[PDB]
Amino acid sequence: LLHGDIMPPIGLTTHDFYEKLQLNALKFPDRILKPIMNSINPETNGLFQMVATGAKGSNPNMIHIMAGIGQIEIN
Amino acid sequence: RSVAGGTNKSGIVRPQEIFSAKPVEAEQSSEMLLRLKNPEVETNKTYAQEIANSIELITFERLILQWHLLYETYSVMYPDFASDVEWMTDFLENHPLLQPPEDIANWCIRLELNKTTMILKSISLESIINSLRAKHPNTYIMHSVE
Amino acid sequence: MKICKACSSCMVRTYVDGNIIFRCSCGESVQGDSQNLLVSSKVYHTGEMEDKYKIFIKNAPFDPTNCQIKKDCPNCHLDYLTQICIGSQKIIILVCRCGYMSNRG
Amino acid sequence: QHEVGQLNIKKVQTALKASLEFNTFYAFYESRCPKGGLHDFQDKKCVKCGLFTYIIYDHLSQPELVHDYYNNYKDQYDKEKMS
Numbered sequence: 444l445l446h447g448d449i450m451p452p453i454g455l456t457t458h459d460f461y462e463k464l465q466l467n468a469l470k471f472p473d474r475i476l477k478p479i480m481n482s483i484n485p486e487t488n489g490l491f492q493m494v495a496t497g498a499k500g501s502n503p504n505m506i507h508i509m510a511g512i513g514q515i516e517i518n
Numbered sequence: 519r520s521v522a523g524g525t526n527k528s529g530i531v532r533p534q535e536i537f538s539a540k541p542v543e544a545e546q547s548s549e550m551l552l553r554l555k556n557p558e559v560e561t562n563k564t565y566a567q568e569i570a571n572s573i574e575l576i577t578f579e580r581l582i583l584q585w586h587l588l589y590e591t592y593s594v595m596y597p598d599f600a601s602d603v604e605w606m607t608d609f610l611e612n613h614p615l616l617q618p619p620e621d622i623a624n625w626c627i628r629l630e631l632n633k634t635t636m637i638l639k640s641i642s643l644e645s646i647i648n649s650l651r652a653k654h655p656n657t658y659i660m661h662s663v664e
Numbered sequence: 665m666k667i668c669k670a671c672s673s674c675m676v677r678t679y680v681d682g683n684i685i686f687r688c689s690c691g692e693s694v695q696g697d698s699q700n701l702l703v704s705s706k707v708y709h710t711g712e713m714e715d716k717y718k719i720f721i722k723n724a725p726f727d728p729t730n731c732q733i734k735k736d737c738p739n740c741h742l743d744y745l746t747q748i749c750i751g752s753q754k755i756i757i758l759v760c761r762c763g764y765m766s767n768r769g
Numbered sequence: 770q771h772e773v774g775q776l777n778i779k780k781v782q783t784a785l786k787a788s789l790e791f792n793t794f795y796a797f798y799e800s801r802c803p804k805g806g807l808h809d810f811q812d813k814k815c816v817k818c819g820l821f822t823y824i825i826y827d828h829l830s831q832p833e834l835v836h837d838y839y840n841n842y843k844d845q846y847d848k849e850k851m852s
């Protein structure tokens with residue numbers, strides 16, 4: 444953006460294209476689970492057992508609790 | 519869900535549109551799905567992007583920076599644009615079969631084209647000239663040297 | 665607009681004779697060709713023009729809440745510059761209190 | 770992943786610069802024609818002078834000729850846009 448290299452496609456302004464690029468860049472990768480499961484004993488971890496068996500919680504809940512919340516998206 | 523214009527799906531906007539039988543002009547998240555009329559070329563992403571950018575609505579107003587209507591005929595001139603007669607005579611020289619007609623009246627618009635929008639939308643001056651000339655019957659249009 | 669010379673009032677245009685005939689409520693007429701052939705005006709990209717941010721861009725180097733970057737000013741050789749981002753096209757302008765501006769602005 | 774630090778930083782940076790320039794040039798002209806006005810099926814420079822060069826950029830030669838023979842138009846359009 445600073446060097447004037449961001450060229451929006453036909454249909455988006457530079458602001459909208461930049462926001463879309465930033466939103467895509469700040470999504471957590473799939474390998475964020477690797478540090479979480481390296482620290483978790485799945486046969487013993489109560490939180491992981493509740494999340495994985497479907498009793499309560501999901502993967503995003505565990506990621507937010509342990510690794511990071513990430514980008515706050517509103518609308 | 520998105521809240522911006524043209525894709526307003528936040529809250530009950532879409533369900534109220536459905537249940538209230540709101541007209542087309544009252545819909546804030548209208549969408550359409552179009553299939554190419556060629557089963558064997560639907561595979562080409564470049565062709566699909568070409569068609570999608572071709573059917574995207576672009577108006578004259580989208581490409582206007584500012585416009586000024588004038589009470590001047592041609593065959594006097596607002597002082598702020600007295601320098602326009604240079605490219606005006608250049609247009610007269612470069613378009614022999616586009617001389618001003620003998621029903622030219624006083625009223626005339628002078629519009630400044632937005633070059634940034636023209637570049638971003640891949641809009642050419644010839645596209646404007648032909649989309650306004652073979653569109654408007656009682657008119658005489660002139661452009662600068664692109 | 666045209667201000668009547670006798671009473672300081674605005675006068676109507678009333679194109680009748682092939683030109684502008686400025687008529688006032690006091691009966692004065694000025695003719696007034698050439699300068700007032702512009703009847704209507706409309707700029708369609710207001711909110712993003714140069715004069716919208718002229719005062720802000722002038723005051724940007726002195727605003728302590730503006731973003732600064734570690735870039736050398738070509739004029740006074742300060743190691744930092746004030747960084748601005750105005751408009752829907754995200755125009756980046758680098759300004760300095762010495763008066764330097766990054767070309768655009 | 771643990772051996773990613775063994776890559777040369779300068780060579781990676783130069784390759785990323787060149788690839789980013791190519792990607793920007795072709796994403797700008799994926800539908801926009803340097804001649805002007807879309808028409809990006811197979812003719813002029815609106816998409817290609819042949820082959821598959823709109824997104825690959827790894828076949829070389831053909832991506833390079835297109836960029837070199839339409840570089841200054843893209844440069845001046847970038848200058849006009851960011852102003």
Ligand SMILES: [Zn+2]
Pocket residue numbers: 668669670671672673688689690691692
């Ligand atoms: Zn008067």
Ligand SMILES: [Zn+2]
Pocket residue numbers: 737738739740741742760761762763764
């Ligand atoms: Zn300075």
